[PDB]
Design a protein around this motif. Sequence first.
Motif, short mmCIF file in Angstrom:
data_model
loop_
_atom_site.label_atom_id
_atom_site.label_comp_id
_atom_site.label_asym_id
_atom_site.label_seq_id
_atom_site.Cartn_x
_atom_site.Cartn_y
_atom_site.Cartn_z
N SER A 2 41.65 53.09 53.61
CA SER A 2 42.28 52.49 52.39
C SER A 2 41.28 52.02 51.32
O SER A 2 40.27 51.41 51.64
CB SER A 2 43.23 51.35 52.60
N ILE A 3 41.55 52.32 50.05
CA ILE A 3 40.67 51.85 48.98
C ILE A 3 41.45 50.94 48.01
O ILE A 3 40.94 50.60 46.94
CB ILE A 3 39.96 53.00 48.25
N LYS A 4 42.67 50.57 48.40
CA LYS A 4 43.49 49.70 47.56
C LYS A 4 43.00 48.25 47.72
O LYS A 4 42.91 47.76 48.84
CB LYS A 4 44.96 49.88 47.93
N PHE A 5 42.59 47.62 46.62
CA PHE A 5 42.05 46.26 46.68
C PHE A 5 42.84 45.40 45.68
O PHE A 5 42.97 45.77 44.52
CB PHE A 5 40.56 46.19 46.37
N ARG A 6 43.34 44.26 46.15
CA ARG A 6 44.05 43.31 45.29
C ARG A 6 43.66 41.89 45.65
O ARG A 6 43.52 41.51 46.81
CB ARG A 6 45.59 43.36 45.43
N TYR A 85 58.44 21.48 36.51
CA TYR A 85 57.95 21.39 37.88
C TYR A 85 58.48 22.59 38.66
O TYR A 85 59.57 23.08 38.37
CB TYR A 85 58.30 19.99 38.39
N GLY A 86 57.63 23.15 39.53
CA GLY A 86 57.96 24.31 40.35
C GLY A 86 57.58 25.61 39.65
O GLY A 86 57.78 26.70 40.21
N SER A 87 57.09 25.48 38.42
CA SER A 87 56.58 26.61 37.65
C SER A 87 55.46 27.26 38.47
O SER A 87 54.66 26.56 39.11
CB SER A 87 56.07 26.26 36.30
N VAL A 88 55.43 28.58 38.40
CA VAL A 88 54.41 29.41 39.07
C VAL A 88 53.67 30.24 38.02
O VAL A 88 54.28 30.97 37.22
CB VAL A 88 55.05 30.31 40.15
N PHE A 89 52.31 30.18 38.05
CA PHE A 89 51.44 31.04 37.28
C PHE A 89 50.68 31.94 38.25
O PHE A 89 50.07 31.43 39.18
CB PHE A 89 50.49 30.19 36.43
N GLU A 90 50.85 33.25 38.14
CA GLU A 90 50.22 34.15 39.10
C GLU A 90 49.37 35.16 38.36
O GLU A 90 49.78 35.73 37.35
CB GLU A 90 51.31 34.77 39.97
N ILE A 91 48.15 35.43 38.88
CA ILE A 91 47.36 36.55 38.38
C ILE A 91 47.05 37.48 39.55
O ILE A 91 46.61 36.97 40.60
CB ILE A 91 46.06 36.07 37.70
N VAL A 92 47.36 38.79 39.41
CA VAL A 92 46.89 39.78 40.36
C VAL A 92 45.72 40.53 39.71
O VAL A 92 45.87 40.99 38.55
CB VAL A 92 47.97 40.78 40.76
N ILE A 93 44.56 40.59 40.41
CA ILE A 93 43.54 41.54 39.98
C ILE A 93 43.46 42.65 40.99
O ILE A 93 43.73 42.48 42.19
CB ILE A 93 42.18 40.91 39.63
N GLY A 94 43.12 43.85 40.52
CA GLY A 94 42.92 44.96 41.44
C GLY A 94 41.71 45.77 41.02
O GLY A 94 41.23 45.62 39.88
N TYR A 95 41.19 46.56 41.97
CA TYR A 95 40.13 47.49 41.70
C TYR A 95 40.39 48.77 42.49
O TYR A 95 40.70 48.70 43.68
CB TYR A 95 38.77 46.92 42.08
N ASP A 96 40.34 49.92 41.81
CA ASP A 96 40.40 51.24 42.41
C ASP A 96 38.99 51.85 42.39
O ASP A 96 38.50 52.22 41.33
CB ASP A 96 41.33 52.14 41.59
N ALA A 97 38.42 52.04 43.58
CA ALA A 97 37.11 52.71 43.68
C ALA A 97 37.14 54.18 43.26
O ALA A 97 36.14 54.72 42.77
CB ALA A 97 36.61 52.59 45.09
N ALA A 98 38.27 54.86 43.44
CA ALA A 98 38.34 56.29 43.14
C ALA A 98 38.12 56.61 41.67
O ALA A 98 37.71 57.74 41.34
CB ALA A 98 39.66 56.86 43.60
N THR A 99 38.46 55.66 40.78
CA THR A 99 38.39 55.81 39.35
C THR A 99 37.47 54.76 38.72
O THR A 99 37.30 54.80 37.52
CB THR A 99 39.80 55.72 38.76
N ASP A 100 36.93 53.86 39.53
CA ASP A 100 36.10 52.73 39.06
C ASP A 100 36.79 51.95 37.96
O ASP A 100 36.19 51.61 36.94
CB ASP A 100 34.74 53.18 38.53
N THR A 101 38.07 51.64 38.20
CA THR A 101 38.83 50.88 37.22
C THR A 101 39.40 49.62 37.84
O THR A 101 39.88 49.60 38.95
CB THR A 101 39.93 51.68 36.55
N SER A 102 39.35 48.55 37.02
CA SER A 102 39.96 47.27 37.32
C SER A 102 41.26 47.11 36.52
O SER A 102 41.46 47.73 35.47
CB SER A 102 39.02 46.14 37.03
N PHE A 103 42.12 46.21 36.98
CA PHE A 103 43.33 45.90 36.23
C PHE A 103 43.74 44.48 36.58
O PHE A 103 43.25 43.94 37.56
CB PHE A 103 44.51 46.85 36.51
N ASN A 104 44.59 43.88 35.74
CA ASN A 104 45.20 42.61 36.10
C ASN A 104 46.67 42.62 35.66
O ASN A 104 47.06 43.32 34.75
CB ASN A 104 44.40 41.46 35.53
#
Length: 167
Positions: A2-6, A85-104
Amino acid sequence: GSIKFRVIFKVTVLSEDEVEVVFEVYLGDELVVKLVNFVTEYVAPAWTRAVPPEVAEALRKAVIEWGKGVAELFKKFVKKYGIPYGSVFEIVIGYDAATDTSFNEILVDGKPVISFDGEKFVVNEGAPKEFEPVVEELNANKELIEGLKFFLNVLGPLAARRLAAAA
């Protein structure tokens, strides 16, 4: 193999002076690290075999420093800007090695009202006007912005590649 990274970073506001801060690291569908309020609650063998201790310690220091900063600023969004109250702030970062690309991907209470374009936060088209002061306060925090950029482009990819190479 697997190369899926989050990485998932979540802040849940409980009260005006209390937030729950969660960091989860995934390789493929597998959780390999979980921090809750900066306490290491889970570390998988996949992580310890992949990441040298000196590197893991730098990464942990980095996440804790940045996360505590973001926590403090979120304490102010609730006290000052009347964010519920109870508010959620979420950030997902990812990286694909196959394309050398990051995303959020960013969610506020499950909604895509804000994005990060690589340099800055922006209120997305059609999103509530009440997010304009929040984005301003985010972009004003030059350390928060620098840190996110460094995770996106340097530390997240570095960890991703180590994890992939050991799987």
